[PDB]
């Protein structure tokens, strides 16, 4: 009978918990106990779905990660390089989803705890992007070492920079958040150059379907749709107070992140099989 708490409306929330105006009732009150925060996972409030979505997604991708790391070395041509190349993706996805549900659980703890776990959440998003670009770059430029190393270095530089700019303090000033968006913008848009490079180095038609670039376009559209649903905060923008617990904008963005990471894995795996069975050579027919 300890750690009792009820939900509260949006009006009586502290400033550091007023991060969405269209969620009227059902908010957790500030509770400076990790025990109560973790216990609240099994209770209904505004953050229940946002916790469970990426909790299940983390379990799912951890399952896929270790299971794929157990695939025997026979099925891979270069097992060591290709497995660490896949380990980057599965690690970044696991860390991203773990940081996400951890932040959403301890979100009501205190201002500083929510602050630090918010930074971890942004760093997790950057890690997921870097992880997603490691195996795609490997299996798209597997016969071209120079551009693979170049694009990998650019993405890693912008990813590391994205993590660092969002972790250290004194950059929370109004005029440094511009470069906060700038580094993440260079990170996000860094995939346009190698995509067209791949679509030009080989035929557009062979890359559209058998090159699995339509699946990369599918996940990109889903990522942009999720970011738009997030910034607009719909459907709760038009029906305020009706999507408090379920089907808020943040929950469908979490689901879209999971689905986009899954279709990325499927598109990469088809880029694998098409590259194992076919292609590889350059200038000889015989």
């Amino acid at each position, epitope marked *: *009978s*300890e750690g009792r708490w*009820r939900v509260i409306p949006y009006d009586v929330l502290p400033d550091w918990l007023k991060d969405n105006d269209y969620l009227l009732h059902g908010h957790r009150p500030p509770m400076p*106990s990790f025990r109560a925060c973790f216990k609240s996972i099994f209770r209904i409030h505004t953050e229940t779905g946002n916790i469970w979505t990426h909790l299940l997604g983390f379990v799912l991708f951890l399952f896929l990660g270790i299971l794929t790391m157990l695939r025997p070395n026979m099925y891979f041509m270069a097992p060591l390089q290709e497995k660490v190349v896949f380990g980057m993706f599965f690690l970044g996805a696991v860390l991203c989803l773990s940081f996400s549900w951890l932040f959403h659980t301890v979100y009501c703890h205190s201002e500083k705890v929510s602050r630090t776990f918010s930074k971890l959440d942004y760093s997790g998003i950057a890690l997921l992007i870097m992880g997603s670009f490691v195996p795609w770059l490997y299996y798209s430029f597997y016969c071209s070492p120079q551009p693979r190393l170049i694009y990998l270095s650019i993405v890693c530089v912008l990813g590391i920079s994205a993590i660092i700019v969002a972790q250290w303090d004194r950059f929370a000033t109004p005029k440094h958040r511009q470069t906060r968006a700038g580094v993440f913008l260079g990170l996000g848009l860094s995939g346009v150059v190698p995509t067209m490079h791949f679509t030009i180095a080989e035929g557009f038609v062979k890359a559209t379907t058998v090159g699995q670039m339509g699946w990369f376009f599918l996940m990109a559209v889903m990522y942009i749709t999720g970011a738009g649903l997030y910034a607009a905060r719909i459907p709760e923008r038009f029906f305020p107070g009706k999507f408090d617990i379920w089907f808020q904008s943040h929950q469908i963005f979490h689901v879209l992140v999971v689905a986009a990471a899954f279709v990325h894995f499927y598109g990469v795996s088809n880029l694998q099989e098409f590259r194992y069975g076919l292609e590889g050579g350059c200038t000889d027919d015989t």
Partner: antibody, heavy 118, light 107 residues
Framework: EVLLQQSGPELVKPGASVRITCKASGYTFTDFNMDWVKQSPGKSLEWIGDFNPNSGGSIYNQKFKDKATFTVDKSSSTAYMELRSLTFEDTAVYYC???????????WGQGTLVTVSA | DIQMTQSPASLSASVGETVTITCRASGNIHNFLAWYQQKQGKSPQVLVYNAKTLADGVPSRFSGSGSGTQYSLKINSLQPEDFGSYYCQQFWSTPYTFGGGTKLEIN
């Protein structure tokens, strides 16, 4: 702003059963629990118990198990406490205090003095 | 039943000076603590909740700190209207309990 108005003073005889009222204004009545506090003269505070007007439930301290009884009027948005079998040790100021999410009290009533003497 | 032991019984200071009131809980209340002020005849008013959160409207000279079983309310630049009895309460375990209180006089 939230206001909690309590009933006026009470002078009763040993064995009587008095009731304290607590009218709440300025907020949605069912949104928060409401606790009751006793303060005997020249002494510290004592938590009598809390009342959930959403479920109409209540939890009582062991030291006030049979003496306190909480009731509600969700229509008039007014919570009541009842003290029966009053003895001389019950002469005290009784407050109603509203919680927010956890059991810290930001809003209090003005207090009701219950005095007992034959 | 967690027992809250407040300290001291009473203390005095002059305007502008700093005072500190300590509170020890017989068990861990996990920062579920509140500090209240009560002037003579008046009802108590909340000063701090969640161990270190300043309540809305409270002057900045009040500040709560501590954790586990040890907590402290500090008052900078004492003001004449700061006299009265200060109380602590734990709202972690039921039944919720209060400290013995601390009487504060100003000279």
């Amino acid at each position: 702003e939230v206001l909690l108005q309590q009933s006026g003073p009470e002078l009763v005889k040993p064995g009587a059963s008095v009731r304290i009222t607590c009218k709440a204004s300025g907020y949605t009545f069912t949104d928060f629990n409401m606790d009751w506090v006793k303060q005997s003269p020249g002494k510290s505070l004592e938590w009598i118990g809390d009342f959930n007007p959403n479920s109409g439930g209540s939890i009582y301290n062991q030291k006030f198990k049979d003496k306190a009884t909480f009731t509600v009027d969700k229509s008039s948005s007014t919570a009541y406490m009842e003290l029966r079998s009053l003895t001389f040790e019950d002469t005290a100021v009784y407050y109603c205090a509203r919680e927010t999410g956890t059991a810290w009290f930001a809003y209090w009533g003005q207090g009701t003095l219950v005095t007992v003497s034959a | 039943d967690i027992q809250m032991t407040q300290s001291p019984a009473s203390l005095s200071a002059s305007v502008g000076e700093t005072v500190t009131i300590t509170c020890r809980a017989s068990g861990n209340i996990h920062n579920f603590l509140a500090w209240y002020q009560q002037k003579q005849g008046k009802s108590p008013q909340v000063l701090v909740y969640n161990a270190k959160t300043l309540a809305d409207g409270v002057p900045s000279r009040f500040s709560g700190s501590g954790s586990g079983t040890q907590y402290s309310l500090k008052i900078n630049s004492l003001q004449p209207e700061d006299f009265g009895s200060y109380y602590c309460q734990q709202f972690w375990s039921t039944p919720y309990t209060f400290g013995g209180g601390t009487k504060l006089e100003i000279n």
